[PDB]
Amino acid sequence: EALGVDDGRLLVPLVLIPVFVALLYGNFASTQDNEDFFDTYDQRR
Amino acid sequence: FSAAVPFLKRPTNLDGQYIGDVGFDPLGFSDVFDLRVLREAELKHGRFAMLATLGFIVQELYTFPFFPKMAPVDAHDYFVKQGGGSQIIFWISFVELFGVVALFETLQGKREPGDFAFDPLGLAKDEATLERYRLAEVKHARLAMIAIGGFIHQYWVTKQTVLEQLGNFKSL
Amino acid sequence: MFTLKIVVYTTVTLFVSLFTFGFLSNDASRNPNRK
Amino acid sequence: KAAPEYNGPSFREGLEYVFSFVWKPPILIAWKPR
Amino acid sequence: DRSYSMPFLERPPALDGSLAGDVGFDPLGFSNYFDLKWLREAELKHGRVCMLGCTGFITQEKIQLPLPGFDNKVATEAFFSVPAGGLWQIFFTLGAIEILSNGGKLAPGDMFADGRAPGDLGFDPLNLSGDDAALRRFILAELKHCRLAMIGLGGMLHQMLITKQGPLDQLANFQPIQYY
Ligand code: CLA
Ligand code: KC2
Ligand SMILES: CC1=C(C#C/C(C)=C/C=C/C(C)=C/C=C/C=C(C)/C=C/C=C(\C)C#CC2=C(C)C[C@@H](O)CC2(C)C)C(C)(C)C[C@H](O)C1
Ligand SMILES: CC1=C(C#C/C(C)=C/C=C/C(C)=C/C=C/C=C(C)/C=C/C=C(\C)C#CC2=C(C)C[C@@H](O)CC2(C)C)C(C)(C)C[C@H](O)C1
Ligand SMILES: CC1=CCCC(C)(C)[C@H]1/C=C/C(C)=C/C=C/C(C)=C/C=C/C=C(C)/C=C/C=C(C)/C=C/C1=C(C)CCCC1(C)C
């Protein structure tokens, strides 16, 4: 009942898909200049 | 001026570069397809046949105990079901992936057709011995491809295995 | 019923993850006044 | 611990090559008409 | 000129003696179209994953932890018996090891961006990679064990799926496929 997950197999999509996308995002994240900006928002992208 | 057939002219691309050449390409298959691909095929068919001929003879005289005794061709059927068939197909297919890579190399001209570089017992001592043997193989492959076809059709009709038929001719 | 549920969960998780990580990809910088 | 530079094709070209293994193998180019 | 492994074919151009475990076997030429450093990291990681896994299939059958549901001898069957949450906790711990080990550079383009000769995630607790000659020969071993394990795990998994028996047990009391 925790996410409507009555069958363990339902947890394979709820984890693998967010991880995989995050993996695509990690490459975007590694390409960014990640030093601190003293600003309202970061214009470096 | 084909040597094998004096009358017909030598087919244009059969010039004796490959051994086993008597100019016999009457229907001109040589011109339409790459000769190199064809030699690969001559030997590859020949190699299966030269082996199969041995097998029909051996399978008749002796069969391993664990397999039921059957006539050589009958077995294509039991083995389709025991599952031995798949194994012999899986492996001969695996060897063949490498064969596709080998062919593409022949087409790029980097491999002599029919050469898998297998001479483990090193029988080929000299470049002449290679030419002698290489011709012998091409002759045996041609004889065997004919004979295996015979062993099978004669059985389809006589319903007798080849050695048995020779013993009891049992003419139609 | 399980297969429809797993397909729906896969689709919803994919789209929600795309939304979440897209708005995490420095969305404020995607304005015409950014230099 | 060898680290070759690999100034070669990109990852997408490699994936396209692996797909061309199954939709365009060099099997039939050996038999080409003249 | 010619691959050592496949004499008929040509040495894959990219492969030279420098990478370890190189007998020239890249017939389909994946090397030409991907980064050897990415490819090696995968040859190693799948093996290291299946050196732990293959040992795992054998150990689980002989000895099982005391906790409930850790009692199924067959590895494939055990995956279902063990509590699902625990399996996810393992997933995540491994997932963290991935990000920390690679330093967050987790993609084909960036993993090797700083140094990181493929497979050097830094685990050499007892320094044994100080001699170079020693390192060059240990590296062949890892690859040769990684390559065997890959083949072994597949065989054990598939043979268990048919037999519903762990590897050592199936060899004992072996029965032909028809019986199962
Ligand atoms: C939070 C979890 C997490 C995260 C973020 C990562 C992060 C990473 N992992 Mg993963 N990993 C994890 C958990 C995680 N790991 C766990 C728990 C395991 C099991 C122990 C693994 C096992 C694993 C392996 C074996 C490999 C990685 C790799 C990687 C790196 C590249 C990721 C990538 O592009 O793959 C994105 C996802 C994909 C590209 C899909 C996978 C590709 C499929 C499965 C290939 C199928 C081949 C096919 C079956 C063969 C053809 C057969 C033929 C007949 C046609 C990255 C650092 C790879 C790496 O370092 O490469 C250099 C690598 O080889 N990881
Ligand atoms: C090596 C990977 C790994 C790490 C790094 C790790 C860290 C922690 C930490 C942080 C320090 C805490 C606080 C914690 C706590 C619990 N872990 Mg543990 N854990 C790991 C692996 C496993 C496995 C494989 C299982 C497991 C379990 C439990 C249960 C029992 C629940 C219950 O009582 O039923 C509790 C409370 C079992 C499970 O969750 O079963 C439902 C079980 O199978 N864990 N775990
Ligand atoms: C390459 C390699 C190696 C190797 C090797 C090998 C394995 C060599 C094997 C060679 C073989 C087996 C050649 C077999 C040829 C069979 C033939 C020509 C059949 C002829 C049948 C005829 C004429 C007939 C017939 C009949 C018909 C049709 C039907 C009947 O009614 C009548 C009749 C009986 C007349 C090794 C390791 C050794 C060493 C090396 O380092 C590399
Ligand atoms: C133990 C643990 C289990 C698990 C474990 C898990 C983690 C299993 C881990 C598994 C994976 C990572 C094993 C990977 C195997 C890949 C091998 C077989 C390779 C084939 C490549 C070769 C043939 C090639 C060749 C190629 C060469 C290189 C170059 C090319 O040009 C040519 C060619 C294509 C021919 C589970 C979870 C089930 C539970 C259990 O209770 C405990
Ligand atoms: C199982 C299932 C239940 C349990 C849990 C689970 C997660 C749900 C899941 C686990 C699953 C995973 C782990 C299952 C997937 C498993 C395993 C790891 C796949 C292994 C494949 C081995 C292949 C077929 C090799 C053939 C080797 C070749 C012929 C050697 C070739 C060689 C080269 C080319 C040339 C030289 C010599 C030769 C010998 C010719």
XYZ file of C-alpha atoms and ligand atoms in Angstrom, chain B residues 50-51 53-54 118-123 140 143-144 147 151 154 162 165-166, ligand 3:
61
model
C 33.139 -34.528 -47.308
C 32.302 -34.895 -43.611
C 29.787 -38.781 -46.511
C 32.058 -40.068 -43.763
C 43.427 -24.102 -39.681
C 46.345 -26.357 -40.168
C 46.839 -27.541 -36.567
C 48.845 -30.679 -37.312
C 50.870 -28.565 -39.761
C 50.576 -31.053 -42.632
C 37.237 -34.378 -53.058
C 33.198 -35.806 -55.653
C 31.672 -35.773 -52.163
C 28.134 -38.727 -53.501
C 23.603 -41.720 -50.510
C 19.325 -44.031 -53.026
C 24.484 -47.477 -48.398
C 22.488 -51.797 -50.336
C 25.929 -52.589 -51.672
C 42.662 -29.537 -41.901
C 43.421 -29.978 -40.773
C 43.232 -31.209 -40.315
C 42.188 -32.089 -40.918
C 41.344 -32.809 -41.436
C 40.332 -33.719 -42.114
C 39.245 -33.829 -41.116
C 40.359 -34.335 -43.382
C 39.247 -35.158 -43.780
C 39.127 -35.398 -45.070
C 38.040 -36.227 -45.632
C 37.169 -37.014 -44.740
C 37.892 -36.229 -46.944
C 36.752 -37.117 -47.422
C 36.458 -37.143 -48.712
C 35.307 -38.095 -48.983
C 35.177 -38.429 -50.257
C 36.126 -37.878 -51.328
C 34.109 -39.349 -50.629
C 34.158 -40.028 -51.760
C 33.074 -40.927 -52.057
C 32.900 -41.487 -53.242
C 33.861 -41.203 -54.395
C 31.792 -42.363 -53.419
C 30.827 -43.100 -53.546
C 29.630 -44.029 -53.686
C 28.505 -43.554 -53.884
C 28.370 -42.045 -54.053
C 27.256 -44.303 -53.430
C 27.433 -45.816 -53.378
O 26.220 -46.436 -53.824
C 28.569 -46.208 -54.311
C 29.873 -45.509 -53.955
C 30.460 -46.144 -52.701
C 30.833 -45.663 -55.126
C 44.208 -31.855 -39.318
C 44.086 -31.593 -37.819
C 44.201 -33.348 -39.615
C 45.681 -31.503 -39.531
C 45.817 -30.144 -40.066
O 46.965 -29.497 -39.502
C 44.686 -29.262 -40.475
